[PDB]
Amino acid sequence: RNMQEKGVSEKEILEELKKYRSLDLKYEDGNIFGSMCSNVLPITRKIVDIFLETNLGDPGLFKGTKLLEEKAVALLGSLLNNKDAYGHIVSGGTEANLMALRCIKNIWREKRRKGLSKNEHPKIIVPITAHFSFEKGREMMDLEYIYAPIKEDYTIDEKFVKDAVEDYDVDGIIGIAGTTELGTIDNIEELSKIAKENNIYIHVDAAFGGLVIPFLDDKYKKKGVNYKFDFSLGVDSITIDPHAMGHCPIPSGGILFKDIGYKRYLDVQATILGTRVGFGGACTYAVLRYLGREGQRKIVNECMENTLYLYKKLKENNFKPVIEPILNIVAIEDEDYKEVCKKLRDRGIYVSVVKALRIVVMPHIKREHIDNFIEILNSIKR
Amino acid sequence: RNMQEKGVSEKEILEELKKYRSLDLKYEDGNIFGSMCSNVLPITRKIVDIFLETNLGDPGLFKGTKLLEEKAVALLGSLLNNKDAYGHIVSGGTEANLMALRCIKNIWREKRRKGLSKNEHPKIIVPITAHFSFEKGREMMDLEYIYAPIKEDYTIDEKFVKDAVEDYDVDGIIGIAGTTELGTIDNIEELSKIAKENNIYIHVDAAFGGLVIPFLDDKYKKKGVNYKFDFSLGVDSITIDPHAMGHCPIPSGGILFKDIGYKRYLDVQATILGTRVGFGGACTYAVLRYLGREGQRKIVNECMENTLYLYKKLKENNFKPVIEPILNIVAIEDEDYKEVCKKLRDRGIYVSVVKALRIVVMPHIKREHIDNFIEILNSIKR
Ligand SMILES: Cc1ncc(COP(=O)(O)O)c(CN[C@@H](Cc2ccc(O)cc2)C(=O)O)c1O
Ligand SMILES: Cc1ncc(COP(=O)(O)O)c(CN[C@@H](Cc2ccc(O)cc2)C(=O)O)c1O
């Protein structure tokens, strides 16, 4: 397509764009099974329109939108047991994780300048289940990762972390509250004890789980799983994303630090982006206020009901889930997962791909879609 | 503000948000004089709504939105004289510049792995007029910058660059097509010759100027200024941002590489962000199609008419512009610029702050606002 001298009418360009949108899948149609995003809360469409022409890169021009970012951060902080959190509503969990990594690296830099570190690059303990944003950060910022192995329950091996912190000079620890692949929860309580006893920064990636775990009804909690992950454990920062299980429009990611003392280690404006949306903070604040805990609890446990329904139907049909679900994520063991995924795609079922098919039971996934999924999968298996 | 158990009604939360929005400035009100963002083209509000629930981080689910990103990149490429450009509609000029820096660094890494570079970190020539995103990149990616001085016309000293490339092993050159502070245009033609003759990557930052320079009427072009900046000069990449002078909603930044061969140097998904908006590509494609060159020409040269009106009125009132404007940016020499800026702010005029006040004559700035500005400034000066 080449740039043209003459413009076209609104009707022409809107009809063209609608033809392309018709090629997309839509969350509400029973096709998308592998996404950690879903339909936005309908009220957010009005909020996006109100705040479209704001820019939190120049907050002096948009004092009210800036106050709403602060209020959104405060509500997330309150949810995470910290009324003094310092943070931002950023572009997503990637930027949030990258900012935590920047903070870790600048704490190390200060030590390095004072002769208080023998590491030529920050050394950070990262579980092998970490999201790919951590690899982007390693690659960009020249970080040294010590990859921590996982246990049979797919959570980080805390004894490895403890041993590594004794053997090596460590600049940071990462724990995950809701892994991307399986929805498992690292033992943040133990990791935070190790971190505190050794004066090591600890970041919790709760991009997905941060807006699920605090709302789980007791019947979905498992004996021997610890669900504690937030600032009550004294962690240094938490990633938590409204555009995942907060029903907010992209871009709405969250990064919270324990207090304002961390801001100075984000100096080079604290965000990676410059010009940036104002509607994310507005939507985050408004959705949490509109729903309250009661409304988010309802949505979370509706997803969990459908998750456990899917788990049951899978076993009934002789499929092997990787684990009993912890959050609203189920994975199905399959040796031919790559080909099965393509056969599912050919029949209108888009899962993600551990030698397993991964299903994220977001609010758009209803019982009828799970039944449909099981029928197609059964047929594929002959 | 604390998280509450009970939710609130839509009317309550919308009225609260509207009270905060009322504390913001609005572009159309004659207050904002220092922003490189402005009012969006009204059609984009419909496009945002259509594409709100898309995600270019998972383009396999949104094939049409992904095609629209490709078409948006193709139209920008065509505008920049390259029908084969490889690129993305990203979150802004910051992410675009960071991706160019990542590419430069990974070309260096490959050399380093083969023993073909004596530099322990990429060495990049950057003019002192570079936008702050280049400092974010330096700080994150451990780049070594050789800062190039500027000439009396505030453009990069090409002889310094040539000499430095002879004296040192250089991994990249940055040229700016529309500086943030003054709107000047580096001699990209000469920089590209140096770069080509020495096999050095060259990136052009046209975040602002890329959607102005191609549309300038001849009466605004100055003798002795070279306006050539695009892929006709053989440069490696160009940043160009629709949410600046493309009238598209944030986030709509642009990064274009000369061809698909650069994609492999963005390997670690090529964007920094993961989950990311689909409406930026839709809006970028649709605005350029809706306006055509004729419609963008009209807007650009309307801004330039108002820029030269402001320049004239300033001189008539014995104020000293830093330079005769090149793009739709004027700066006013003032020793007490900091205090004058605060006095302007107190009277409803928000400029930015070179010991000068900076005015960006975006489409929302009309003659009446310039007249109002001059009266207030005169009064402030007594
Ligand atoms: C634990 C965790 N941390 C960080 C991130 C990064 O967040 P952003 O994508 O907001 O930057 C993700 C993303 N999780 C999903 C994101 C996603 C969403 C929708 C999709 O259709 C596909 C993928 C994933 O990579 O699987 C995540 O799972
Ligand atoms: C040449 C140049 N390159 C890159 C960027 C970064 O682009 P993003 O801000 O899209 O990441 C800018 C931003 N120029 C403006 C951005 C801006 C816009 C509106 C404002 O109110 C204030 C600032 C500046 O920093 O001045 C720029 O001027």
Swiss-Prot record, chains A, B:
Domain of life of the native organism: Archaea
Catalytic activity annotation: L-tyrosine + H(+) = tyramine + CO2; L-aspartate + H(+) = beta-alanine + CO2
The protein's annotated pathway: Cofactor biosynthesis; methanofuran biosynthesis; Cofactor biosynthesis; coenzyme A biosynthesis
Record note on temperature dependence: Thermostable. Retains full tyrosine decarboxylase activity after heating at 100 degrees Celsius for 10 minutes and 42% of its activity after 10 minutes at 110 degrees Celsius. Inactive after 10 minutes at 121 degrees Celsius.
Cofactor names: pyridoxal 5'-phosphate
Protein name in UniProt: L-tyrosine/L-aspartate decarboxylase
Molecular function (Gene Ontology), one example: pyridoxal phosphate binding
Keywords assigned: Decarboxylase, Lyase, Pyridoxal phosphate
Database matches in PANTHER family: PTHR42735, SPHINGOSINE-1-PHOSPHATE LYASE 1 (PTHR42735:SF6)
pH dependence: Optimum pH is 7.5-8.5 for tyrosine decarboxylase activity.
Listed GO biological process terms: carboxylic acid metabolic process; coenzyme A biosynthetic process; methanofuran biosynthetic process
